[PDB]
Design a protein around this ligand. Structure first.
Ligand SMILES: *[C@@H]1O[C@H](CO)[C@@H](O)[C@H](O[C@H]2OC[C@@H](O)[C@H](O)[C@H]2O)[C@H]1O
Ligand SMILES: *[C@@H]1O[C@H](CO)[C@@H](O)[C@H](O)[C@H]1NC(C)=O
Ligand SMILES: *[C@@H]1O[C@H](CO)[C@@H](O)[C@H](O)[C@H]1NC(C)=O
Ligand SMILES: *[C@@H]1O[C@H](CO)[C@@H](O)[C@H](O)[C@H]1O
Ligand SMILES: *[C@@H]1O[C@@H](C)[C@@H](O)[C@@H](O)[C@@H]1O
Ligand SMILES: [Ca+2]
Ligand SMILES: [Ca+2]
Length: 115
């Protein structure tokens, strides 16, 4: 009694393996259950942060981030001050999807561009 050779009961192209008196199914990525019938949806753990959208494939997820965020789970608040936008020795303060400049004395404008 091969049991597997009489016809595999595994779904989702899982591999039937004989066990003493029975069988087990070894599933491909993204599936589980005794016969590989359960789809694992990695978005069920709500991995995408900061109002990102979660997209599912077997074995994986992808987050689509709101502006201002990056990383696999949208967990990184991008530092928009990296590019030193505040001119004339201004001080850049990072914001969500933006920055604010505190301008030295004698300068003004969103980026301290005015004198
Ligand atoms: C970094 O400095 C450059 C100019 O040197 C600006 O182009 C960038 O401003 C952009 O991307 C992030 C947005 O939040 C900003 O409003 C936008 O200007 C600045 O990040
Ligand atoms: C999920 O499927 C894998 C792959 O076959 C299996 O090793 C594991 O035991 C399953 N998990 C549960 C909780 O059934
Ligand atoms: C971060 O987001 C930018 C787009 O804003 C993208 O180019 C980059 O690949 C992302 N990095 C990671 C680690 O998700
Ligand atoms: C559930 O959320 C965790 C992160 O917290 C992630 O690692 C899994 O991929 C996801 O299904
Ligand atoms: C998935 O992407 C995110 C960034 C938001 O725009 C959501 O409204 C969308 O459903
Ligand atoms: Ca899935
Ligand atoms: Ca930011």
């Amino acid at each position: 009694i091969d049991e597997c050779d009489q016809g595999s009961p595994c779904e989702h192209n899982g591999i039937c393996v004989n066990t003493p008196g029975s069988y087990r199914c070894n599933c491909s990525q993204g599936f589980t259950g005794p016969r590989c019938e359960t789809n694992i949806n990695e978005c069920e753990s709500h991995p995408c942060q900061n109002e990102g959208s979660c997209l599912d494939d077997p074995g994986t997820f992808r987050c689509v981030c709101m502006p201002g965020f990056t990383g696999t789970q949208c967990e990184i608040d991008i530092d928009e001050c990296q590019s030193n936008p505040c001119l004339n020795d201004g001080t850049c303060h990072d914001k969500i999807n933006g920055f604010k400049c505190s301008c030295a004395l004698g300068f003004t404008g969103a980026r301290c561009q005015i004198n």
